[PDB]
Design a protein around this ligand. Structure first.
Ligand code: NA
Lengths: 134, 132
């Protein structure tokens, strides 16, 4: 009957979710901490942010400008080798502009490329998010 | 084999997509993907499988004319059969309805998988619009 989930896939998914929950709390240090030191963010309206200093600067600007209220869904979890994996997610909910106060619907889709650190921890090496709507 | 450095073969595969895309060559674009390939791009939900990929690229090229130059930012082989490539493109986009030409820049992540026959194919692909 039962489907058992590979223990390493469970730990990998938990690493992607650690980001999504930190992001939805707008907790920037928790967000930064999920990335490898050479991590890259590719998001809409901004060129790639490379490394924790550039990452911090982008997320600071995002949470200054906009408030997100989002639910996530995990779409796939795949381990491609001992130290590498990917996760695909989708988030949806609302976006509030902090200047104007205007709340609008928002949906995104995300790809995490995860790498297992030398001490056994899964971290986001590369991350891409695209806006589905509006 | 053409070059023994697998990294060059991997980069080659990503460049074949970007050039196919810039030529608006949909069959050539579809053929760079695995059968279960995923495209994640702006304004649309994930397209999963060649049937869904076809539909989206059809619609993109029905709606917009792209005139783009590419740059490869990184090529990384993570294991024997897996790699990633990060690139960026910039140029103009022309809306085919309105005729309005506007500057466009994008950034792209490829996850490529080496097939049973030795070909590098795109398994997962994300593109995000930098501007405007
Ligand atoms: Na073109």
């Amino acid at each position: 009957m039962s489907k058992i989930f590979n223990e390493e896939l469970a730990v990998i998914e938990a690493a992607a979710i650690a980001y999504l929950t930190a992001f939805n709390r707008a907790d920037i240090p928790a967000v930064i901490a999920t990335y490898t030191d050479d991590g890259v963010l590719m998001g809409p309206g901004r060129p790639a942010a490379v490394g924790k200093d550039e990452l911090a600067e982008v997320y600071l600007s995002v949470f200054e400008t906009v408030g997100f209220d989002m639910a996530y869904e995990i779409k796939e979890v795949v381990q491609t080798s001992a130290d590498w994996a990917f996760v695909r997610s989708a988030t949806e909910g609302t976006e509030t502009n902090k200047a104007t106060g205007v709340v609008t619907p928002a949906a995104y889709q995300e790809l995490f490329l995860l790498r297992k650190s030398a001490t056994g921890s899964w971290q986001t090496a590369r991350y891409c998010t695209s806006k589905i709507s509006p």
